């Protein structure tokens, strides 16, 4: 028996020690080997309440990755508060491995196994576990990548539906490929990502159809970011240490939906992207400059599994609700995976 509690978790992995890839070495040193036979017993006709927005596991992962980033990814240059930072800025080996987070004595992890669970509230089908599933510390903005899927419907999650200031996390029931490339051998920073327009607009068509059910069959509207930094306004990410900022403007093509056999909205989509070495860390910690790019063939391929969203304010339109891409932050990246979990203290 238990009571809701927060406590400090630990991590586990099959990280490889010879890999200099940082996740391998790190997890090799900061996390442990797996339990080969973990037990899980279901409790009959029990309902439990959840709150996906407060699980220090999030705080622990964010803190950890931040501490790492602060101590691992020294840029050639950092501009922070009142200090000025200079250095050599070397190349790395980079490739995330799965991380499991596991609980100690006197606490346990509760899991909502309700296939249609929204992340807070009662879960009818609940299980208990010793350790989590493997979570990629996928750093992204706008879009959550390579995450776990809802086993049934696409799931919408949010702290306050009425509050447009509250980020909306979209949980996919179908992965979407994005294929990003700087081809071998002139703009040395120019790259592009190709995505299948059809898969996306189809699922999305379905999401809209679905959204109306929640928005009184009201008009569903996408709008471009009102404005802001590329770091917050674009899907920003890292491939082998190189920094991408990709413009998602082309994606909210309203005219591209209605099953109307149409042009413009078609074929394999090749989106142009560009790289910046110098950024303001969203940690609010300052500015960073990294060294220049490798010679040769550059490629990062990703599966899309989630989305962060911001809503336009301006009630009384009474027909429409307006939305703009961009939602909260990476804590949401960890959150999107955690809606069904909470740590409890055993009593």
């Amino acid at each position: 028996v238990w009571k809701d509690a927060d406590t400090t978790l630990f991590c586990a992995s099959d990280a490889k020690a010879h890999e200099t890839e940082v996740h391998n070495v790190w997890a090799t040193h900061a996390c442990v080997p797996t339990d080969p036979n973990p037990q899980e017993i279901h409790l009959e006709n029990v309902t439990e309440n959840f709150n996906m927005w407060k699980n220090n596991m999030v705080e622990q992962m964010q803190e950890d990755v931040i501490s790492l980033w602060d101590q691992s990814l020294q840029p050639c240059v950092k501009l922070t508060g009142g200090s000025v930072i200079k250095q050599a800025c070397p190349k790395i080996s980079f490739d995330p491995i799965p991380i499991h987070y596991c609980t100690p004595a006197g606490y346990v992890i509760l899991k909502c196994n309700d296939k249609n669970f929204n992340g807070t509230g009662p879960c009818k089908n609940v299980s208990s576990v010793q350790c989590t599933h493997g979570i990629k510390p996928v750093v992204s903005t706008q879009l959550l990548l390579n995450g776990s899927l809802a086993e049934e419907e696409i799931i919408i999650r949010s702290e306050n539906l009425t509050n447009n200031a509250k980020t909306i996390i979209v949980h996919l029931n179908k992965s979407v490929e994005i294929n990003c490339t700087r081809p071998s051998n002139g703009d040395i920073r120019k790259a592009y990502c190709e995505i299948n327009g059809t898969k996306w607009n189809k699922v999305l068509k379905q999401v809209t159809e679905k959204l109306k059910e929640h928005f009184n069959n009201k008009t569903i509207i996408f709008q471009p970011p009102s404005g802001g930094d590329l770091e917050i306004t674009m899907h920003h990410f890292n491939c082998r240490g190189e920094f991408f900022y990709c413009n998602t403007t082309q994606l909210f093509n309203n005219t591209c939906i209605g099953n109307e056999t149409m042009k413009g909205c078609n074929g394999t989509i090749t989106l142009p992207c560009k790289i910046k070495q110098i950024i303001n860390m969203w940690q609010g910690t300052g500015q960073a400059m990294y060294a220049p790019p490798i010679d040769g063939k550059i490629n990062c391929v990703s599966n899309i599994t989630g989305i962060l969203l911001t809503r336009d304010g301006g009630a009384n339109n009474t027909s429409n609700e307006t939305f703009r891409p961009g939602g909260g932050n990476i804590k949401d990246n960890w959150r999107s995976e955690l809606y069904k979990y909470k740590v409890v203290q055993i009593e």
Partner: antibody
Amino acid sequence: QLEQSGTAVRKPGASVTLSCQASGYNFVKYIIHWVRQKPGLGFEWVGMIDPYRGRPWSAHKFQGRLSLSRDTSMEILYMTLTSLKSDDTATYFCARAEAASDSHSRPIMFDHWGQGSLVTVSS
Amino acid sequence: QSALTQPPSASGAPGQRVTISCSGGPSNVGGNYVYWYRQFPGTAPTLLILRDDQRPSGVPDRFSASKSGNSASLAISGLRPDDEGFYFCATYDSDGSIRLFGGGTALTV
């Protein structure tokens, strides 16, 4: 802790620039709603400016017209508006909130307010 | 959503008990709560009533808030003179959307 400040008059049709400097911590986790005053009356939400990131928001009603701005490091702000009008004379304001997102108090409200940023708009 | 509708207040007298609501088009639970404000020269317009908190640090007890219906009621048993100033309701409008404000009221009389 909280000083708004601006100059009074410029001609209509044009554009403008507005500050509100505050404490760093208040810049840590508090968005600041800009509101405005009219001769002797109650307030108006214009938009919100987050402390973080700089993810901007204000009503869609300026889509071609609007831009939002700030300063994380210098603990300070800027706003800018288009389409000034001769009738547009009155005081502006800035306001915060812990927002069920600061502390474990978890309240949303306009805690402290601006000294007011005067306006006098004449063609 | 939601609107608002306020009479000017109030040609009172230096002490008598007064009760003023901040009533919105939501004539239901809304405005579910409100912040009523001081609003002075060179000053911060200074809030009076919090919801999800009481009165903060540096705040005294004589201001109580109670409603039912849309029938809000910002109440003073003991009127005061530097209430010779302006006071406005602030909206949650369900933490948006969107947040409105009241008609303002002043009692110097």
